[PDB]
Amino acid sequence: LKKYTIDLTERAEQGKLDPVIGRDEEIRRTIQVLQRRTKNNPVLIGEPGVGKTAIVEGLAQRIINGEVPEGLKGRRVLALDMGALVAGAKYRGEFEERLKGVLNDLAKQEGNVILFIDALHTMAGNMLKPALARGELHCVGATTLDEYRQYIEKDAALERRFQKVFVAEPSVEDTIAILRGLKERYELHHHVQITDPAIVAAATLSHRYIADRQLPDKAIDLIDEAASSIRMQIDSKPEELDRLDRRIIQLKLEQQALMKESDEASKKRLDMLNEELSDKERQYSELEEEMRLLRNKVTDAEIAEVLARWTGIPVSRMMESEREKLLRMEQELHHRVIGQNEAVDAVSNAIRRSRAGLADPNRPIGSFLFLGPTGVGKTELCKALANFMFDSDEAMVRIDMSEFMEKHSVSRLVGAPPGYVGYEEGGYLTEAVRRRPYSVILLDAVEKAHPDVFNILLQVLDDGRLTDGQGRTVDFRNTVVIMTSNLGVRETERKSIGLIHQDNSTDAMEEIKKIFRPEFINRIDEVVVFHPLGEQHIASIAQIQLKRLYKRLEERGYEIHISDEALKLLSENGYDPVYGARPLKRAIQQQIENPLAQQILSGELVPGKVIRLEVNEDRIVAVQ
Amino acid sequence: DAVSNAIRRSRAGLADPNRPIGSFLFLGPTGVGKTELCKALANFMFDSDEAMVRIDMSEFMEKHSVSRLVGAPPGYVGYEEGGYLTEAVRRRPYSVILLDAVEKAHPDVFNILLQVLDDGRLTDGQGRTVDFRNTVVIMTSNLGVRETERKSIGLIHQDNSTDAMEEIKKIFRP
Amino acid sequence: PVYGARPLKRAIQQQIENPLAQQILSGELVPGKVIRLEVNEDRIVAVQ
Amino acid sequence: QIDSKPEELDRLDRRIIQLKLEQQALMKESDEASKKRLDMLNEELSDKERQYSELEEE
Amino acid sequence: AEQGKLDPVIGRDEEIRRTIQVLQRRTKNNPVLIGEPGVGKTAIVEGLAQRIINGEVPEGLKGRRVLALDMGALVAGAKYRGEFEERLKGVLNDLAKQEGNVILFIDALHTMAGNMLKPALARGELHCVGATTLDEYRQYIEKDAALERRFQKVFVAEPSVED
Ligand SMILES: Nc1ncnc2c1ncn2[C@@H]1O[C@H](COP(=O)(O)OP(=O)(O)OP(O)(O)=S)[C@@H](O)[C@H]1O
Ligand SMILES: Nc1ncnc2c1ncn2[C@@H]1O[C@H](COP(=O)(O)OP(=O)(O)OP(O)(O)=S)[C@@H](O)[C@H]1O
Ligand SMILES: Nc1ncnc2c1ncn2[C@@H]1O[C@H](COP(=O)(O)OP(=O)(O)OP(O)(O)=S)[C@@H](O)[C@H]1O
Ligand SMILES: Nc1ncnc2c1ncn2[C@@H]1O[C@H](COP(=O)(O)OP(=O)(O)OP(O)(O)=S)[C@@H](O)[C@H]1O
């Protein structure tokens, strides 16, 4: 008891055990087990982070703090932790000897020293049952759910040794009382003065967002991380000084990339960045020679910037300048997708209300069932939205739902039942959107998937979470979906002419209301129906079809200027009454790119010189 | 009044001990607020929507989904991880369970469900007994929406009951 | 008749709350005061 | 229950220990005009002290 | 690193501020670099060592020095029941002798026993550095809320042209 044990009451005497304000219920549950003769060893069972070790050591905090009544005063808490019994016994038999020594010690305590097994799955059993049979061992269990059950559940002799402990959960109120009850201990443990908004945002926002740990402790280590980044601010220089100096370090690593060259002077095209280097010396000198350089407002906005680096709705963007690209979000789509006014306003306004957040957080954000014709370019619009917000097309997780015809379809895409290859491989959308849950959940042709797939669209559209075969919640409460499904193609291509719009809504709503409930008609953002294009739109997609060719042949170092007559021939070959604007790239390549390749390989086009496409033909030809 | 009188019967004590406490079949058009009322049922007596999980019978249609509700056969992943029904009831047997669209489930969940109803004992992949004899279940349906919203004009309630009980009759027992 | 008062969630958030979000985040509406649902013209507009 | 303080007595004493150590949390705040709302927990604490004094006497 | 035998880095300041900013905690205290074996995360912990030792770092990481428990001498002679145990308790007590002025960059973080590592990481008595592959940080474990209270990660994405 003097060699192997750690005195938890002494830990609560000096105060290395962080004081626990509240929860008298389960410490009273411990004391109620301690008066109990049989089933005398309590087992603290919660999730990890219900504080099982901290409830035994806080039971020592009660035994020193006198909140315990008569009966246990004198019965001493001494904790056999792991690591203690692992002494230099290189040979056998001495283990049973030293255990016989310490069980003669608690055998002569006679209810004066209480034993404790920290992380109960450690310790034995061949010797504690006599010491739990006379009345001489008084041990305590504190370990997790899996480590108590797999410690032992099913021995009816050892569950005769161990009683479990179960809890009750009130509101976020007493979590706020944990955070204010601990915030000055982490002032003198975290070098600050904890104002309230960081911890009340930690409590309420922890009860809203975090689906991995539990109240209040997820808020507690959020304040740990918070005061960590705060002391990162405390011991460094003031703010904009570190803006200047840190961008000096990283950007001089960029010029460190941008100096070791073949010819240094000609590719010093970054000369503005070096005048800006001496300018960073200039304003960085203004602010080194020269609060709002301080934050006791920790802040909710700034650990909302940390959590905003986590989730997928930012607030670090919120203190930036964003309204100028918001007010021409239509026109910044018109740089690559022109026309379709109720589509760019219904879709773009649906993006505004979506990432603005006007619905339930326990509802999805941008929820779209697309229904309409072809000849439009849906995946290039999905690339316009990943290349719009995601700034390039990583989010385009394209998972075709066409494969799913037989009985076992939700074992296919949801994930297989365990005990097989398919569960560890998981489902299709379940896994490839399990990697990025807060992203574009892009789907083509969902209608051929199961009714069960339809009602788990009713799960990610009502609830906004997903469940595989095992039974956990993949969180979708912070993602925008795009469903470029192939529901519309035959109905909306076949509807012209002879079928009015209410009839396509009638039989398409006979498919939806054939399987879905009214919330699939209702709870999407918009039913976005497209229309065919005009001639100036053909001119615009010619221009932006050329801008990619400008940057592409720009990487080689050539120049091409095109007259208006070739524009007139492409406008002539642009539109057909049956198909629309799709074969334009094929006509451009078949009439333009054949003599261009023929003369760039033939030798008639000279490198290092400007190229111009003229017409010494009845079609487009190349010349120098 | 139906669910509230079911609560007064629940805390009152009328029930047969070889039965579940509450079991109902809801039919009709959709738009009434079923699982919002189940969120109020998670709000009233044990006081928390944290204790509302909402369970579905749709994804569980396969050859091994019987071993999803009972746990896998031995020698499998999900045998040591168990099943959703056996672990879920085995943690706290006195709780509120929210099922959806049981027609999606097989006649093997209807016979495990019969063991919820009759004689009160479920044997899993392993085979040990499962305590179901004081458990409250809630099961919603799509039989109401898929033949009521179009037949709301003209049809009567008895014929609604019969043309539910036909496809029920093909795949359930009385 | 089939649908009921179910779409009224998005009749509110869609039908009024899109220009309301435009006017709140536009900077016209300074926060901090008691809101009275005023009447501009025949489509519902909230004014601060 | 006979050796120590009675059941309704330590229900009450432990409700007032919930509210009192809840105030030991609830002292240091951020701004006054928002988070000194807790008037209602104070009059509930008056029910706590009065009922605990009543069954303290009885 | 004083002798300068290690590999340099180019750029790498924002997400290594994510590495230092995930270093200086108490429990969750240890960073994890995420990514496959063709990205270079050991250059990020050793460029971390070059910021700590060379001196662009502010106050706090001036004197900190990094050690490395490896599995090789752990499994070298495990002849009897206790050799590996006397040697690992020697590791933990030598962690106690430099008193937390030992940084322990454990690469292959799941390799390092553990119930003797958990409470010292919990009190503040232990503080290390972790590293595991993208798929293998999906394999490490995140739902053990205890081992959620022992470690934390650093985010790195798909590489670009300019870098
Ligand atoms: N009210 C509180 N007062 C003080 N510290 C608290 C409080 N709530 C949580 N903690 C912290 O909770 C942390 C975890 O407690 P533990 O003693 O590890 O209990 P535990 O859940 O059994 O951990 P194990 O045994 O490793 S599973 C400690 O580091 C405490 O700082
Ligand atoms: N606006 C556009 N800009 C650039 N390329 C386009 C455009 N529209 C179509 N394309 C090209 O033509 C192809 C067809 O466009 P998509 O965006 O895939 O149309 P789609 O309806 O999504 O076809 P799916 O996905 O096979 S049903 C694209 O992959 C591009 O190569
Ligand atoms: N009348 C209503 N009152 C309140 N909330 C409603 C109502 N109707 C729908 N909801 C919301 O929409 C969700 C689904 O609608 P429900 O009324 O529960 O019908 P349902 O049959 O449960 O559909 P589910 O939940 O997808 S199986 C609920 O969880 C609520 O969030
Ligand atoms: N950041 C870097 N800076 C400098 N050289 C690097 C860098 N990353 C990789 N290298 C080079 O690549 C070689 C090995 O790359 P590693 O850094 O070991 O890749 P890795 O991601 O660490 O994968 P491991 O270590 O095999 S798991 C080194 O010998 C260097 O030549």
For chain B, give the secondary structure using H, E and C: CHHHHHHHHHHHCCCCCCCCCCCCCCCCCCCCCHHHHHHHHHHHCCCCHHHCCECCCCCCCCCCCHHHHCCCCCCCCCCCCCCHHHHHHHHCCCCEEEECCHHHCCCCHHHHHHHHHCCCCCCCCCCCCCCCCCCEEEECCCCCHHHHCCCCCCCCHHHHHHHHHHHHHHHCCC
Give dist(CA B159, CA A355) in Å, integer.
Answer: 47
Which one-letter DSSP state was computed for residue A417?
A: P
Q: Could you say which ligand is closest to the alpha carbon of residue B40?
A: 3
Strand partners, B136: B96
CA angle at residue A488 from A483 to A492, to 5 degrees? 150
Give dist(CA A284, CA A278) in Å, integer.
Answer: 10
At residue D15, the 3 state secondary structure works out as helix
Pocket test for ligand 2, best of A335, A379, A528 (most atoms within 8 A of CB): A379
How far does A173 lie from chain B, in Å, by closest CA? 14
Strand partners, A165: A44
Q: Which chain A residues are within 8 Å of E92, Cβ to Cβ?
A: 83
Asked whether E123 and E144 are in contact (CB, 8 A), the reply is: no
Is A9 known as a binding-site position?
no
At residue A441, the 3 state secondary structure works out as strand
Any chains having at least 3 CB pairs less than 8 A from chain A are B, C, D, E
User: Dihedrals φ, ψ of E60, to 5°?
Assistant: 125, -45
At residue A464, the 3 state secondary structure works out as coil
Return the C-alpha torsion angle B97, A50, A460, A412, nearest 10.
Answer: -80
Asked whether A311 and A480 are in contact (CB, 8 A), the reply is: no
How far does A108 lie from chain E, in Å, by closest CA? 29
Give dist(CA E147, CA E140) in Å, integer.
Answer: 10
Asked whether B60 and B99 are in contact (CB, 8 A), the reply is: no
CA of E140 to the centre of ligand 1 (A): 22
Contacts of residue E148, Cβ cutoff 8 Å, sequence gap at least 6: A48, A49, A212, A213, E28, E142
Give dist(CA A145, CA A501) in Å, integer.
Answer: 58
Indicate the angle between helix axes A584-591 and A593-602, nearest 10 degrees.
30
At residue A476, the 3 state secondary structure works out as coil
Q: How many CB atoms neighbour CB D10 within 10 A?
A: 17
Give dist(CA A399, CA A484) in Å, integer.
Answer: 11
CA of A512 to the centre of ligand 3 (A): 17
Q: Solving technique for this entry?
A: cryo-EM
CA distance to A179, A384, C8, per residue, from A480 (Å):
34, 14, 22
Is B89 known as a binding-site position?
no
Asked whether A485 and A384 are in contact (CB, 8 A), the reply is: no
Could you say which of A349, A359, A518 has the minimum Cβ distance to residue C6? A518
At residue A118, the 3 state secondary structure works out as strand
Q: Which chain E residues are within 8 Å of A215, Cβ to Cβ?
A: none
At residue A152, the 3 state secondary structure works out as coil
- Token pair recorded at residue B99: 């099922």
At residue A125, the 3 state secondary structure works out as coil
Touching pair D, B by Cβ (3+ pairs < 8 Å): no
**CB-CB under 8 Å, E119 with A118:** yes
Pocket test for ligand 4, best of E42, E48, E51 (most atoms within 8 A of CB): E42
How far does C10 lie from chain B, in Å, by closest CA? 14
At residue A81, the 3 state secondary structure works out as coil
Is E60 known as a binding-site position?
no
**CB-CB under 8 Å, E92 with A83:** yes
Contacts of residue A114, Cβ cutoff 8 Å, sequence gap at least 6: A34, A75, A76, A77, A78, A138, A139, A140
Asked whether E93 and A88 are in contact (CB, 8 A), the reply is: no
Across the A/D interface, how many CB contacts are shorter than 8 Å?
A: 45
Q: Which chain A residues are within 8 Å of B42, Cβ to Cβ?
A: none
Is E19 known as a binding-site position?
no
**In ligand 1, which atom is closest to the CA atom of A18?**
4
CA angle at residue A300 from A295 to A304, to 5 degrees? 115
CA distance to A211, A418, A423, B132, per residue, from B88 (Å):
18, 17, 20, 12
**CB-CB under 8 Å, A86 with E56:** no
Give dist(CA E65, CA A443) in Å, integer.
Answer: 51
Pocket test for ligand 4, best of E5, E6, E7, E13 (most atoms within 8 A of CB): E7
Q: Which of A565, A558, A559 is nearest to A615 (CA)?
A: A565
User: Dihedrals φ, ψ of A238, to 5°?
Assistant: -65, 175
Asked whether A326 and A442 are in contact (CB, 8 A), the reply is: no
Which one-letter DSSP state was computed for residue A390?
A: S
Give dist(CA A607, CA A618) in Å, integer.
Answer: 26
How far does C33 lie from chain A, in Å, by closest CA? 20
Q: Are strands A76-77 and A113-114 parallel, antiparallel or unpaired?
A: parallel
How far does C46 lie from chain B, in Å, by closest CA? 29
User: Dihedrals φ, ψ of A66, to 5°?
Assistant: 75, 15
Which one-letter DSSP state was computed for residue A615?
A: -
Is A378 known as a binding-site position?
yes
Give dist(CA E153, CA E44) in Å, integer.
Answer: 13
Give the position of tokens 């050793």: E46
Give dist(CA A473, CA E162) in Å, integer.
Answer: 39
Q: Could you say which ligand is closest to the alpha carbon of residue A146?
A: 1
Burial of residue B82 (CB within 10 Å: 0-12, 13-18, 19+) is buried
Give exposure, E77-114, as e/b (b: 16+ Cβ within 10 Å).
eeeeebebbeebbebbeebeeeeeebbbbbeebeebee
CA distance to A116, A152, A293, per residue, from A237 (Å):
48, 55, 9
**Residue type, position B43, single letter:** N
Could you say which of A326, A359, A521 has the minimum Cβ distance to residue C13? A359
Burial of residue B57 (CB within 10 Å: 0-12, 13-18, 19+) is buried
Rg, C-alpha atoms of chain E:
16
User: CA of A181: which chain D residue's CA is closest?
Assistant: D25
Give the position of tokens 């007032």: D16
CA of A383 to the centre of ligand 2 (A): 9
**Residue type, position A202, single letter:** A
Asked whether A354 and A480 are in contact (CB, 8 A), the reply is: yes
Asked whether E156 and E34 are in contact (CB, 8 A), the reply is: yes
State the sign of the Cα–Cα–Cα–Cα dihedral B15, B21, B25, B30: positive
User: Is the CB of E48 within 6 Å of ligand 4?
Assistant: no
**CB-CB under 8 Å, A212 with E142:** yes
**CB-CB under 8 Å, E28 with A224:** yes
CA distance to A358, A540, B74, C39, C40, per residue, from C48 (Å):
19, 41, 67, 11, 12
**CB-CB under 8 Å, A469 with B59:** yes
CA of A396 to the centre of ligand 2 (A): 13
Strand partners, A164: A43
Give dist(CA B166, CA A469) in Å, integer.
Answer: 31
Touching pair B, A by Cβ (3+ pairs < 8 Å): yes
**Residue type, position A284, single letter:** Y
**CB-CB under 8 Å, C22 with A353:** no
CA angle at residue B115 from B113 to B116, to 5 degrees? 60
Q: Could you say which ligand is closest to the alpha carbon of residue A82?
A: 1
CA of A340 to the centre of ligand 2 (A): 16
Give dist(CA A60, CA A73) in Å, integer.
Answer: 11
**CB-CB under 8 Å, A197 with D30:** yes
Long-range CB contact pairs, A199-207, < 8 A, 24+: A199/A223, A200/A176, A200/D30, A200/D35, A201/A300, A201/A303, A201/A304, A202/A226, A202/A303, A203/A172, A203/A175, A203/A176, A203/A178, A203/A179, A204/A172, A204/A176, A205/A300, A205/A304, A205/A307, A206/A172, A206/A175, A207/A172, A207/A175
Give dist(CA A233, CA A297) in Å, integer.
Answer: 13
First to last CA, chain C: 36
Give dist(CA A359, CA C17) in Å, integer.
Answer: 10
User: CA of A414: which chain B residue's CA is closest?
Assistant: B59
CA angle at residue C27 from C23 to C29, to 5 degrees? 65
Give dist(CA B88, CA B92) in Å, integer.
Answer: 7
Touching pair B, C by Cβ (3+ pairs < 8 Å): yes
